[PDB]
Design a protein around this nucleic acid. Structure first.
Length: 116
RNA sequence: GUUGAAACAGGGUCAGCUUGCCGUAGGUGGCAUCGCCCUCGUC
């Protein structure tokens, strides 16, 4: 995804090792270090509300990286909709129930698995 | 006899410790059993 100026910016910020060091020397960095599992994200300036992961190329990339990579998986068949719709192992971490986002529907122990 | 099987609520933890129902208060004050009535009549 080149010529974005949002990800070329961060890819030039993630090939820096010093500006990232400058992130620790920020006014409020001491308050993000307090929260375990802080989630930083990359809003390039000159978009002003829009993250690097909000530009209409990363937006399309994700809409392309959730339409190509998450479509070659196990071909069928949906429990929910019944369509072919490639099957999703690893249901996504439903947040707000547990102490951590937990996979609402998740059969992961040696025998909760039914038929192998 | 090819098709959800197997599966714990467990193990256990004094509700204890303790705390006057009390101090205290007239049943009083007061009120006629009265007014009255042949044991008679008589052998």
């Amino acid at each position: 995804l080149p010529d974005d100026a949002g990800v070329t910016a961060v890819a030039a910020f993630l090939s820096s090792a010093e500006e990232k060091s400058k992130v620790m020397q920020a006014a409020n960095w001491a308050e993000c270090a307090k929260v375990k599992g802080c989630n930083l994200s990359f809003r390039l300036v000159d978009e002003a509300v829009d993250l690097v992961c909000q530009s209409k190329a990363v937006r399309e990339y994700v809409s392309q990286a959730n339409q190509t990579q998450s479509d070659n998986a196990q071909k069928g068949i949906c429990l929910v909709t019944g369509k072919a719709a490639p099957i999703a192992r690893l249901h996504n971490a439903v947040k707000g129930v547990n102490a951590k986002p937990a996979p609402f529907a998740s059969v992961n122990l040696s025998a909760f698995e039914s038929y192998g």
